[PDB]
Amino acid sequence: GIPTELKPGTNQFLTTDDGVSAPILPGFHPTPPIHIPGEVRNLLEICRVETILEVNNLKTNETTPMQRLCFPVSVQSKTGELCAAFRADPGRDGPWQSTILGQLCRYYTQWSGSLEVTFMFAGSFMATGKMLIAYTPPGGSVPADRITAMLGTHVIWDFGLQSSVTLVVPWISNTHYRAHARAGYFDYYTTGIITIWYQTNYVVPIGAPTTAYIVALAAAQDNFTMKLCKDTEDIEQTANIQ
Amino acid sequence: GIPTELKPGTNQFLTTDDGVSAPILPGFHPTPPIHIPGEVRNLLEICRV
Amino acid sequence: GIPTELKPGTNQFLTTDDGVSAPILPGFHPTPPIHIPGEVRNLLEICRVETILEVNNLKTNETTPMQRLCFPVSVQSKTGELCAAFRADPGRDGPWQSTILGQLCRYYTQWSGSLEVTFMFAGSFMATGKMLIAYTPPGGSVPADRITAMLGTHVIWDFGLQSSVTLVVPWISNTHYRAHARAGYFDYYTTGIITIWYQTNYVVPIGAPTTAYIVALAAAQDNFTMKLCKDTEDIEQTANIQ
Amino acid sequence: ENSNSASEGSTINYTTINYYKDAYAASAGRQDAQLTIGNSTITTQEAANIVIAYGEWPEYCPDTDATAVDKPTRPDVSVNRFFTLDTKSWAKDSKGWYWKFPDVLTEVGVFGQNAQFHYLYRSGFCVHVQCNASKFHQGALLVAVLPEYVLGTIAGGTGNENSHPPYATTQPGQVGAVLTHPYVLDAGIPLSQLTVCPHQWINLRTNNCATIIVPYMNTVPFDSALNHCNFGLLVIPVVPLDFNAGATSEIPITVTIAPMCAEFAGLRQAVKQ
Amino acid sequence: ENSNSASEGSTINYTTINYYKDAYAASAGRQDAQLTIGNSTITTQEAANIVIAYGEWPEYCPDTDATAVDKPTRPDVSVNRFFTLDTKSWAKDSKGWYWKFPDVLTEVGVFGQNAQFHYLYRSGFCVHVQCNASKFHQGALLVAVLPEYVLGTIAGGTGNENSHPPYATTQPGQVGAVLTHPYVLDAGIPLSQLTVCPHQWINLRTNNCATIIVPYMNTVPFDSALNHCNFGLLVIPVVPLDFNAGATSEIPITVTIAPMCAEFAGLRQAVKQ
Amino acid sequence: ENSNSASEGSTINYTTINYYKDAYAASAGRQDAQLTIGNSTITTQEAANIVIAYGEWPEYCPDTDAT
Amino acid sequence: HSTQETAIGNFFSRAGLVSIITMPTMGTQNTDGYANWDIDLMGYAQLRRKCELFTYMRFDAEFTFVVAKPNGELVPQLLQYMYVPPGAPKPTSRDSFAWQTATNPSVFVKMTDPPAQVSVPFMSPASAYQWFYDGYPTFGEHLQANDLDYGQCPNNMMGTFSIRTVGTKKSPHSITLRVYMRIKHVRAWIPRPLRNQPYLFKTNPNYKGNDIKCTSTSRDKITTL
Amino acid sequence: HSTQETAIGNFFSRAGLVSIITMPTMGTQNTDGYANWDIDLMGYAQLRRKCELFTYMRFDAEFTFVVAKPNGELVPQLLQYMYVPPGAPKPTSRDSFAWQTATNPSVFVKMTDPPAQVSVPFMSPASAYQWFYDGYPTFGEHLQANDLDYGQCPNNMMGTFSIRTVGTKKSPHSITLRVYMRIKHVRAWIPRPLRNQPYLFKTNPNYKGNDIKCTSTSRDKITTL
Ligand SMILES: CCCCCCCCCCCCC/C=C/[C@H](O)[C@H](N)CO
Ligand SMILES: CCCCCCCCCCCCC/C=C/[C@H](O)[C@H](N)CO
């Protein structure tokens, strides 16, 4: 016989190893496939669709989860109140867990590419006003005033003739990839802070409601890339499945 | 010798696995066949009667 | 199946054996590299740079290690005093342990090629004089006088207009390679003795210090070659690393 | 190397090494507007542009995938037309409603009668939703199409009881049914992820209408119309409509649907359910 | 055979046999003067020739390795210029000083202000040291550049205590800090091996000046200027200066530095530390 | 493949696979009257024809096999 | 940056635990020496959450059978595997006629040998596996007692898997089996939302009504991070 | 004379001991049946001195896992390996959900089988590993209690490695694991001096202040050999 040499690693099973096994049904011919709509060959196509991002999350809204989908806006008596603020990291515990982007991002460790956040105005047609949506690069805290937040990337948008605004989050990083940023020592990977600010005011005529709700959407772009698959925290077994 | 690597599934017997075994009669020459009527190569011909 | 034949050496692990194992991350694409200065593909480039050689090593200088980097020179009342002497073997316990050449040479057993030793004059600009730096081939002891040391390879150098001198140690050997010379039976591999001698005198004007220090440098040349990697004595574990 | 494998029916090619005669035992390898349909018509001037579900138009079953030897009927005019359903009165606490296709039209028109006399069913659908409001009304509706929408059960709230939803909830009929916990959609799945499937937003300040064209999606070319429900329709008031006192409080929601490219087979007796 | 490997980004080729689809699981195989910068200028007639660190000049970040989508600022005149620091009085027992770049210039000039408003930082540096002496003075200084210079701690001298150096020693600022045990450089590493890195000798009998051009060296193209210190600067009096009585005992050490090819990105708020 | 084997001195050829340098360690393979002599003479008229043992006549030793 | 990692080929292909089967010596269940396990892959939570991304799925499966004693040690015990297609006789005992292995595939492996590997083609009569089936498999009326048939796709039951120890006498050593699967040659359709609620039952996606877990964490104020 | 021996390819490529992990039956630590070991290669002195020649280093790693009983003998015990990337669940027990091996790689090996070998690519998000990091990973002020973050490169923590014995019952035999690494496809930069002082702590290069060992031997007189 042919002389053979055994090496370490024999008689082991690697779960990620792609091998060739023995068929139990010689020449088995399955059913011929048909044309089924919606063929998805890559998980990126699911990350590129706009999904609802929940900006408002409170301990008082745990009884009514439906209030998580939007945040209120009304008439202000002062200048430059902070409407909302949230982290820009999709793989961090927080608002990004509601979108399909963060859920599929938790399967992976290192992520890269630029993202986008879309706001939707559900208010009345005759209610006008303007908002200032700013993005602060890493290293900044929650800006105290509007003069502090404007120092970064911001956008100005109107209520009346447009129903949506898209804030493109640019890719600003020291490394080509970002691991998921967690508490403490892992804050080095934080993407930034997305703050929305009152620019002018919420103006409403007589006969229309003075309180409106804004729906926030979030998705990825064509340059978005992930790698290094892993387990997530979003499924748990405390008991057997009956 | 040639370096080899063992994979799971060694030392097993699969009943449907089609292998190659060692002959017990080297160069054994059976009896030459003749022409027998009714040669059936597929079970469908029996289902069609 | 294909007839196979097992040979002795199966189910063993050789630490120096270069094999092929199974990947745990199919098609994993790492981060694209960038241009980082100082790419070193061979350990010889580190051995060819001049590093400080400590000629003066005494039990009284153990409290002040900074005095090891140089040896004093002053005015002499007699003819031909021996300033310093040291072994020429880079892999022997002694002065050569301070240079990066000897440290990287301890990883290896058999070494070959010609070396070089550089002296630096840190004295005053107006102080003049001359030195005799000689190299004795193997078999000689420490020369008692200057007439004995001159019989080998020597060089004459001046203080005033030159700040450095390089003594090239030629390759004189019976064998193409030299194993590290240790005490007793292993003295067969000794390279030689490098002795520095007072040639004329240390002449200094009035107003300048009469005591100067000389810094010694050591490195290798392009013909320097090593082989047969091994463990060194310069790292020890007497306890676990907390 | 015979071709028995599962990936050999697609248009993508893969490289793989195989030491046996079956290709499925091999390894993985390198990876590489006015709409007039039939006798009925509609004109939507306030509506957003038509959203084609999964970018494919409904079409007749090709002979390549068709496993039936019968020659199907194509009653173009008596089958495919706009069918208007009942209106749903909106309220501030309204949780939303859902319909099960094609169970809604089983009792209505020629489409419903021929569906009872035929065992095999394939058609595409046309989804249209109508919600009217004035300039003083602020609200948002989410109209989405989720294929294979399965109803869950709270299991009494404890979780130790095994219970299934009855035929009234799983087969609401023409009138439809109302959601209980819209957050999980009674599927145990988030509402924020519903937009992954084809969807359209109805915002009362801009578009008061919605149109979605959903083709036939199943693992089989033909299937029984009575038992199998293809996809559901979800009209969810994400943003509650707000209006001050004196405004009209009755806001209807009208849903009209139409089949597209219907093929029936297996003419049989009268079968209700 | 896809190209996933680690050695496939270099210019050297290797031969290797691989039985799998990943190249990283394969085997090893066969192995194969007057300087005017910006608004400031200097003329050094006593200085030795300029020593280029690792034989590369500082240059702008190429688009191949650049991962940032922002367009960086290049304030050529207000950023890159000679910056003179405080002078260090030499004494016979002086153990030497060390500075942490780029932490020295964070408080100085336009370079320091734009560094606080920008998250990403890349630049090259110019190191220059000045020590003056007469013909009656004999001494030697060692000016070396050690990338990624980490400060250690004696751990109380016993070794059983875990302690880290505070921010005052790790970030000395513009004034700098003094060495404790110059033999180990507080790195636990020999001083005789310091010449492996780019270095220059200052010998008071010949050259009273030193010039070293150090480019940007990091595993990342851009990095935060505040937290990360690129390399340190070591001026070590190896040979103690000796002079008789009556000579001038005050010998200053002047260190002036300049940035080269600076690029800033990520304009943000004011961030001190 | 040196020729050390035992069957390599005959006129018949065999096919065999060998994984070593010696051919004897390989496998088997496919298999493929009046007579006057000198000063004396005899005449046998009643005798049957001469039977040659193993069909070979006695002959001198050739130089090939002669040691 | 390469997209090969986020593709469905590498994400769906690897080993996971679809089944846990035991044969204890003392107990009320498997102590007879054999086990009859109907094939269900949804008793395992985490791989179920991966397969619920998509409605229709077409693929092939490679299996790995690991055998060990409940304490973790091993004994020289010979085991027998057999696959029972729908309609084939299910074994009533260890000496039963069904284990005689006439036309049914079987695998023989010991406990000292490496785990057994087999390749299973696509055996479903339809074009792809249907995970969530909306409708009823049966005709006629459905009452409260017949509501169990809801969410049941007849194409998803491909057979029954069984194990036993060889020999007529009972084996003194207990055996625990762990079934593994690697998905390959996969084709996918119809993405779905990912379930945010804990699993309860195998056959249907029931959720606990008393507590509905929010998909995102909560904080004290919207303007404070 | 060939320079192939002194090249960084052959000098960096071979096996060395980066970790020692034990699972004793009686004791206060690992007796629960499982071990969670954060990945650190600097707890070993001699290979650390080899890697400290260079600042930035880019390479691949091949591993060898040797299992034996603390007395040196062997028992037929089945073991399970798993790699936990950052963010992935760390096991709280031996029956814990994390060991179920859904998307996380795992290796199965016995104690009678030869040591297991795996290949680890370059997983760091940067261009190369940074051994000595000068700075802080965190923003804002740093007090005496927060000084622990000094010398910590966030790119150097690539995950956590864990081991356990299979089965629900506790295994009566103790297990000692020795982790090995072979560096291949290596690229190097920025040479550094070789440390002449004994090691103390893993995370930072602390040296004992009372006694500073001279890098060279001492003699009585400079003129006498
Ligand atoms: C030699 C023994 C081979 C044993 C073969 C057992 C066949 C198991 C095939 C599993 C592949 C998926 C089959 C169906 C999975 C889920 O349980 C179904 N959706 C059930 O609803
Ligand atoms: C199937 C089990 C595989 C286990 C894989 C474990 C990954 C270990 C990779 C080691 C390669 C070097 C990683 C970092 C080394 C040093 O600890 C870091 N510098 C820590 O500072």
Numbering used by the authors:
A (entry chain C), C (entry chain C): 1 to 242
B (entry chain C): 1 to 49
D (entry chain B), E (entry chain B): 14 to 45, 83 to 323
F (entry chain B): 14 to 45, 83 to 117
G (entry chain A), H (entry chain A): 73 to 297
The authors write:
Coxsackievirus A16 (CVA16), a member of the Enterovirus genus within the Picornaviridae family, is one of the major causative agents of hand, foot and mouth disease (HFMD) prevalent in infants and young children. Like other enteroviruses (EVs), CVA16 is a nonenveloped virus of ~30 nm in diameter with a single-stranded, positive-sense RNA genome of ~7.4 kb in length packaged in a protein shell termed capsid. Specifically, CVA16 utilizes cell surface heparan sulfate (HS) glycosaminoglycans as its attachment receptor, and human scavenger receptor B2 (SCARB2, also known as lysosomal integral membrane protein 2, LIMP-2) as its uncoating receptor. Cryo-EM studies show that 9B5 and 8C4 target distinct epitopes located at the 5-fold and 3-fold protrusions of CVA16 capsids, respectively, and exhibit differential binding preference to three forms of naturally occurring CVA16 particles.
